[PDB]
Write a protein that binds this ligand. Structure first.
Ligand SMILES: *[C@@H]1O[C@H](CO)[C@@H](O[C@@H]2O[C@H](CO)[C@@H](O)[C@H](O)[C@H]2NC(C)=O)[C@H](O)[C@H]1NC(C)=O
Ligand SMILES: *[C@@H]1O[C@H](CO)[C@@H](O[C@@H]2O[C@H](CO)[C@@H](O)[C@H](O)[C@H]2NC(C)=O)[C@H](O)[C@H]1NC(C)=O
Ligand SMILES: CC(=O)N[C@@H]1[C@@H](O)[C@H](O)[C@@H](CO)O[C@H]1O
Ligand SMILES: CC(=O)N[C@@H]1[C@@H](O)[C@H](O)[C@@H](CO)O[C@H]1O
Ligand SMILES: *[C@@H]1O[C@H](CO)[C@@H](O)[C@H](O)[C@H]1NC(C)=O
Ligand SMILES: *[C@@H]1O[C@H](CO)[C@@H](O)[C@H](O)[C@H]1NC(C)=O
Ligand SMILES: *[C@@H]1O[C@H](CO)[C@@H](O)[C@H](O)[C@H]1NC(C)=O
Ligand SMILES: *[C@@H]1O[C@H](CO)[C@@H](O)[C@H](O)[C@H]1NC(C)=O
Ligand SMILES: *[C@@H]1O[C@H](CO)[C@@H](O)[C@H](O)[C@H]1NC(C)=O
Ligand SMILES: *[C@@H]1O[C@H](CO)[C@@H](O)[C@H](O)[C@H]1NC(C)=O
Ligand SMILES: *[C@@H]1O[C@H](CO)[C@@H](O)[C@H](O)[C@H]1NC(C)=O
Ligand SMILES: *[C@@H]1O[C@H](CO)[C@@H](O)[C@H](O)[C@H]1NC(C)=O
Ligand SMILES: *[C@@H]1O[C@H](CO)[C@@H](O)[C@H](O)[C@H]1NC(C)=O
Ligand SMILES: *[C@@H]1O[C@H](CO)[C@@H](O)[C@H](O)[C@H]1NC(C)=O
Ligand SMILES: *[C@@H]1O[C@H](CO)[C@@H](O)[C@H](O)[C@H]1NC(C)=O
Ligand SMILES: *[C@@H]1O[C@H](CO)[C@@H](O)[C@H](O)[C@H]1NC(C)=O
Ligand SMILES: *[C@@H]1O[C@H](CO)[C@@H](O)[C@H](O)[C@H]1NC(C)=O
Ligand SMILES: *[C@@H]1O[C@H](CO)[C@@H](O)[C@H](O)[C@H]1NC(C)=O
Ligand SMILES: *[C@@H]1O[C@H](CO)[C@@H](O)[C@H](O)[C@H]1NC(C)=O
Ligand SMILES: *[C@@H]1O[C@H](CO)[C@@H](O)[C@H](O)[C@H]1NC(C)=O
Ligand SMILES: *[C@@H]1O[C@H](CO)[C@@H](O)[C@H](O)[C@H]1NC(C)=O
Lengths: 596, 96, 597, 96
């Protein structure tokens, strides 16, 4: 793209005409600094293409980069350029800002360009900073260009302010003013206080707070999106943290609130490119709101010994109520000192059978005198416990005479009232027993239970009556309700001889007769049965012996050891005893003295 | 070299003096604009009454119009005429 | 009484002249002067009438004012006075304050007098109020007096400032300035924060506050009184609430604290007439203070069932420690959920025998790694309880066969280890102990022995009372009692002479036409209203009979007897006979018998 | 009738302007005296840099001695010469 006016520079005065050509082959695009309207004209025509551009009159506001672009071809992905200057005896500046300076959005630390370009390239321009500063171009960090302006490398803080370019032409001083404006636009975050769905009365006042955060040299523009029409007022303000931080408040107020005012309210913080919007809801119209339901009231059935029990109930209310918990009625409040409140709940520490009763709960909303009491009954299970287990009955594992009537008893208590059942266990395996059972163990007379109120508790005591003790068993009484079970083993050994450990005595007439002794030892206690002779003189005793190899007649029930001596003289007579050990215990021995 | 006592008392007694009021303090509702200059010189009541029970309050006020540059964030900036309050006469009155 | 030379109330005089005044009376005269110069003027004083005179050398405008001869120089004792006006062509003000104005302490609402008096009574004086204001005298609120100055009744707020009196003489303007200054001096109250006996470390920094409260238009002067010599600094400052109030602050600071600095510190706020002094003490020298003792540790012996028991122990510590309580060791901390804390105390709500143990407490003062533990032992008494009472023994109103060895047991447990003992009580139609020979006799007592059996987890103690030969009906009461409580149980010990209490002696009949002798034996006092029944039934009709037409009823202790005899028993006089015996303990007990001839 | 923008800007930029300083702010240690006048006119740094990040700080200062009246409660009154700081030149600098 060849141009008519050969070169990059051109001289021209005011009132003249421009004449530029651009001969080529394809169409050319014209680049101009200032594009007015309906002032000048242009056209374009083997056969060589030629483009041109004319101009009528001449003004200083049409001076700058003029270029013929040969880029108007998609396949051509060479351009000419030339500077055109229009001088004048009046204003030597293209951009005249004398009264009001022009605003220059800049940024600290980066490049800054001052666009106070002149018309003549020989005019000496001076750049000054308000009020007593003058920047001197050095050709490196600050470079002066009569076609472009002032180029500043790394714009520090000492360039944010009012700058002015001055030039003297024919003894007349002219000046244009510029204003560098450091400004960002970083809408950091927004937040509505409080983000909770607000509840109010039909006729109360709605108050909403929206807070914005931005750095320095930046503003926002806050607005509220409400569903209804023009309600009331809405004030906005600003606060500086002076670091680098700006805070923006926005207060929305609706003095007259009605049922229609219920809806969504959105705070919109717009500042051009970046945009933020946080939303929150508002409910209304409630007059006096108290509604209390629960979980499974009022059949709360807990068990004794429970650790960290908890009751609960759901409460729909407005506004915040005063909740006080009660027990069996009545005040209560925290009468038992244990337990705990908090959370519309009633957490029990450790549960005992005395914790039963109709737990009341009174929810008091003051400022309107709206109270609502609620009953909640609690029943504590106790589980069974057989009281006869605790009493230590000393009479060693009980042995009963053969063919004797015996009677047993087991007492237990709990909530609900537990049930008892007996069993059997022989000794050479359990058996439910009734008034015709169980072929037969021992002859059962009667099994009957009663409801006795002893030790302040309504206990239950059953009694199994053995009509005829015959076989050695182990009666088990088992008490159990629906929350636990417990049994007690009734040691029922049996004997055939009086009180166990009997000595059958068949003495002798006189000297030379026979002796027949029989020692009966109950079932399988008192192991190691034997006999003993003894006679004492002065301070000495000692026993004797045995054994005559008469081992060993065992019998259920009660074993035997018969000692027989044939033809007793005067010295073969003295004191005879039956010495037997024992299990658990605790040795026993039964004596007998006779001399012939 | 030392300023006399009577000069200090008269130049500091409750009288209208030129003060540089921040514009944002007089108009906190237009938070969507950056103003230049951010402060304007205004004749406001300054000085002391030399008595803790007296306060330098205005008794005669007026209104003045100034050209302030309003800068909207990234969306144009225009010059506007904003009005401010000034004090012509000040007097010492009891507080509250 | 005092006669004066220059008769009248006014006088005219010029500069450079002299004064010549007389005062003739009987006693001495006192001369009242507005301004006694010094050794400048002179005075002397001489039937015979006492005469007193007064002279003057030169004339100065400073001596305008009240010249009076007081005749009050007598304790048993009228006064004459006159104004001397000494003028001068500049300056005509007596007291001229050109550079520095004169301060006039005043008060709002009261009277204010401006002491700008002139020499000539015909001088016109203008009063001006800074900035630009002029007060015109009217004779009531503002009165002019060329002898004293300007008199102002009811001084409002507009009179607080710089006042200037001006006068023009010989084309020249003169002026004097006065500065009205309202001021009080009411030190309301002072307070040191905090008034507690402050404690600090040997080497810490002491900082003390002292607040002073005064109304408007007044100052104070605050100081600190410490026992040592010059230590460190002490800043001060003033703050205003604007209502109307002033607050003054005094901050004493000693960066290097030592043992000698311990003492008394008094903040002394002075202002002239009014004065206040608030003081406080300071202790120091301590380095890392943790010292814990108690009251009766560690023999704490509460009893079970106690509601709200409270341990404690004295803690002398500095600074504030973090206290954690422990039980049997170990963490603990509040493992049992209950047992609250706070107040360096250990409060148990409901005490049980599982609460015993050596309660340890850990007191932790951080920032120096200084901890101190302490052990305190708790023993809980349980009180006795007989377990035979808990069991519901159905059988019975207990009776026993005559001449039988019976064994009676009582099992009880408590802390301390309880004690059991048996007594006696008959019935027939204040107690004594029983042992191995006692007690003539109740019943033939054999062996009473107790033993230590470990049942149900507790080491319980059970006694067994063994009767060798039950002969008389009594009630053996076993009683268990330690030092914290007692519990007894009476064991009903009846006695029967007949099998199981109820008996029917059966002496039948050979054949028809014979006799019948029936005998019903009932025990002492457990079945009453004894009778005889006969049955026999044809289908669904049955019912009872009778009885009771004799023969009487013989009550023989123990256990009564009922003899029924029938003569000539036929085929219809024999069926099913029974002995019915009602009772009040539990109703009904009938024993049947069928025989037919 | 309307104030020109160039005058409003230059009269509001960071420059030393006469400000009425309260003496108690300059001397908070002398709390036992009542100063008259309680305020003094001093040349201090006033105005705005028109940039929230910059601040109007002084670069050249000096002190000036004035005669202030000191009024001790009920204990006499005297005139004293006291010193007061002034700002000769101000400039815009970053705060951090
Ligand atoms: C360049 O500056 C000239 C100054 O002469 C302006 O031209 C004037 O524009 C106004 C705007 O409507 C017209 O009313 C005038 O008639 C125009 N001419 C004159 C002599 O004032 C305009 O700002 C620019 N004109 C061009 C062609 O660039
Ligand atoms: C002192 O101040 C004024 C002057 O008398 C009293 O308040 C009122 O002042 C107006 C004019 O300033 C008068 O017209 C009223 O008559 C005044 N009221 C009364 C009740 O006098 C004020 O009361 C005076 N107080 C004293 C104690 O003298
Ligand atoms: C269910 C309920 O709370 N009923 C109460 C009633 O007990 C009381 O007597 C009355 C006041 O007279 O108010 C209502
Ligand atoms: C407040 C003070 O400095 N001293 C008081 C004293 O006036 C008072 O009489 C005494 C009570 O007896 O208590 C102390
Ligand atoms: C720009 O400002 C000064 C120029 O010397 C310098 O302190 C600063 O570091 C420069 N910035 C960068 C990114 O170099
Ligand atoms: C909203 O902000 C204003 C500003 O002072 C405050 O008074 C008000 O209490 C705030 N409201 C809420 C609900 O935080
Ligand atoms: C409300 O805020 C939520 C937050 O994620 C958003 O998803 C929603 O679009 C907003 N607007 C509504 C619910 O109208
Ligand atoms: C709980 O129930 C009892 C049962 O008799 C009854 O008196 C009352 O209605 C309730 N409230 C109490 C006792 O406070
Ligand atoms: C419940 O509360 C209401 C309060 O209005 C009142 O009747 C009384 O206090 C309570 N009534 C009953 C029956 O508990
Ligand atoms: C009771 O006897 C049965 C018989 O085998 C035994 O299994 C059970 O463990 C006994 N009870 C106790 C508590 O030991
Ligand atoms: C024991 O004595 C009797 C007495 O007559 C005698 O008959 C008998 O033979 C003797 N010997 C034995 C072993 O019985
Ligand atoms: C000056 O004029 C405004 C007009 O908006 C009016 O509010 C009031 O008279 C004055 N306001 C201020 C802030 O000076
Ligand atoms: C007042 O001052 C002294 C005496 O107090 C004297 O020297 C002087 O002349 C008097 N008069 C004047 C006008 O100073
Ligand atoms: C001062 O004024 C009084 C008022 O009547 C007058 O009598 C007197 O002559 C006057 N004196 C002079 C010196 O003018
Ligand atoms: C002392 O008073 C000052 C002034 O109010 C206060 O800032 C400071 O916290 C106070 N010090 C104490 C220890 O109370
Ligand atoms: C310190 O203050 C107390 C509290 O009023 C007061 O009793 C005491 O007299 C004062 N002076 C001294 C030296 O304790
Ligand atoms: C437990 O308490 C006893 C009672 O004096 C004490 O001797 C012992 O050291 C304590 N042991 C622990 C581990 O606390
Ligand atoms: C206190 O307890 C801690 C940790 O249990 C232990 O390290 C320390 O030695 C104990 N101190 C004393 C004095 O027992
Ligand atoms: C005997 O037992 C009965 C139980 O009914 C009791 O009332 C009575 O007090 C007891 N006797 C004595 C002396 O305690
Ligand atoms: C009963 O019959 C016998 C037999 O004859 C007779 O002896 C007796 O007297 C009769 N009984 C009466 C009371 O008559
Ligand atoms: C007086 O000048 C000195 C020297 O710069 C300065 O330290 C002092 O602060 C000045 N006075 C006041 C009241 O600031």
């Amino acid at each position: 793209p060849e141009l008519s006016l050969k070169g990059t520079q051109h001289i021209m005065q005011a009132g003249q005409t421009l004449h530029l050509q651009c001969r080529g082959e394809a169409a050319h695009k014209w680049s101009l600094p200032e594009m007015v309207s309906k002032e000048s004209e242009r056209l374009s025509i083997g056969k060589q293409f030629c483009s041109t551009l004319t101009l009528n009159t001449a003004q200083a506001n049409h001076t700058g980069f003029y270029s013929c672009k040969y880029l108007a071809v998609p396949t051509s992905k060479t351009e000419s350029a030339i500077y055109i200057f229009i001088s004048d005896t009046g204003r030597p500046f293209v951009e005249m800002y004398s009264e009001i300076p022009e605003i220059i959005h800049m940024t600290e630390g980066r490049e800054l360009v001052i666009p106070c370009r002149v018309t003549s390239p020989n005019i000496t321009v001076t750049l000054k900073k308000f009020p007593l500063d003058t920047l001197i171009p050095d050709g490196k960090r600050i470079i002066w260009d009569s076609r472009k302006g002032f180029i500043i490398s790394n714009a520090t803080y000492k360039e944010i302010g009012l700058l002015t370019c001055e030039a003297t032409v024919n003894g007349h001083l002219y000046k244009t003013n510029y204003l560098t404006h450091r400004q960002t636009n970083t809408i950091i975050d927004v937040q509505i206080s409080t983000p909770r769905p607000v509840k109010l009365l039909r006729g109360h006042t709605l108050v909403l707070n929206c807070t914005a955060t931005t750095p320095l040299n930046t503003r926002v523009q806050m607005t509220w999106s409400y569903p209804d029409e023009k309600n009331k007022r809405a004030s906005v303000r600003r606060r500086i943290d002076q670091s680098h931080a700006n805070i923006f408040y926005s207060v929305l107020t609706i003095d007259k609130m009605q049922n229609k005012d219920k809806g969504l309210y959105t705070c919109r913080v717009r500042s051009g490119p970046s945009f933020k919007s946080v939303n929150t809801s508002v409910h209304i119209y409630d007059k006096a709101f108290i509604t209390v339901k629960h979980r499974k009231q009022q059949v709360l059935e807990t068990v004794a010994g429970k650790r960290s029990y908890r009751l609960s109930m759901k409460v729909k209310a407005f506004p915040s109520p005063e909740v006080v918990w009660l027990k069996d009625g009545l005040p209560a409040t925290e009468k038992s000192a244990r337990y705990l409140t908090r959370g519309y709940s009633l957490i029990i520490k450790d549960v005992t059978e005395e914790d039963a009763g109709n737990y009341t709960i009174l929810l008091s909303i003051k400022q309107s005198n709206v109270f609502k009491n609620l009953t909640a009954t609690l029943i504590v299970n106790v589980k069974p416990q057989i009281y006869e287990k605790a009493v230590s009955s000393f009479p060693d594992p009980a042995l009963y005479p053969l063919g004797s009537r015996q009677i047993l008893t087991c007492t237990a208590y709990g909530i609900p009232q537990p049930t008892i059942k007996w069993f059997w266990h022989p000794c050479n395996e359990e058996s439910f027993i009734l008034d015709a059972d169980s072929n037969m163990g021992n002859r059962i007379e009667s099994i009957t239970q009663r409801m006795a109120i002893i030790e302040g508790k309504n206990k239950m005591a059953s009694t199994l009556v053995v009509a005829d003790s015959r076989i050695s068993g182990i009666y088990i009484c088992i008490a159990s309700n629906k929350v636990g079970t417990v049994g007690r083993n009734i040691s029922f050994y049996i004997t055939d001889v009086p009180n166990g450990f009997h000595v059958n005595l068949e003495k002798m007439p006189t000297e030379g007769e026979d002796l027949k002794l029989s020692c009966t030892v109950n079932k399988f206690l008192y192991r190691d049965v034997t006999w003993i002779l003894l006679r004492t003189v002065n301070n000495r005793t000692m026993h004797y012996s045995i054994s005559k190899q008469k081992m060993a007649i065992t019998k259920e029930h009660s074993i035997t050891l018969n000692l027989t001596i044939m033809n007793v003289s005067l010295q073969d007579s003295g004191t005879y005893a039956c010495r037997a050990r024992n299990v658990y215990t605790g040795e026993e021995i039964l004596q007998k003295k006779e001399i012939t | 070299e030392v300023v006399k006592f009577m000069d200090v008392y008269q130049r500091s007694y409750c009288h209208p003096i030129e003060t540089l009021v921040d514009i944002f303090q007089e108009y906190p509702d237009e938070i969507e604009y950056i103003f230049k200059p951010s402060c304007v010189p205004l004749m406001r009541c300054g000085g002391c009454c030399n008595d803790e029970g007296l306060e330098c309050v205005p008794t005669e006020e007026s209104n003045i119009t100034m050209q302030i540059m309003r800068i909207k964030p990234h969306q144009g900036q225009h010059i506007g005429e904003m009005s401010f309050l000034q004090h012509n006469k000040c007097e010492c009155r009891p507080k509250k």
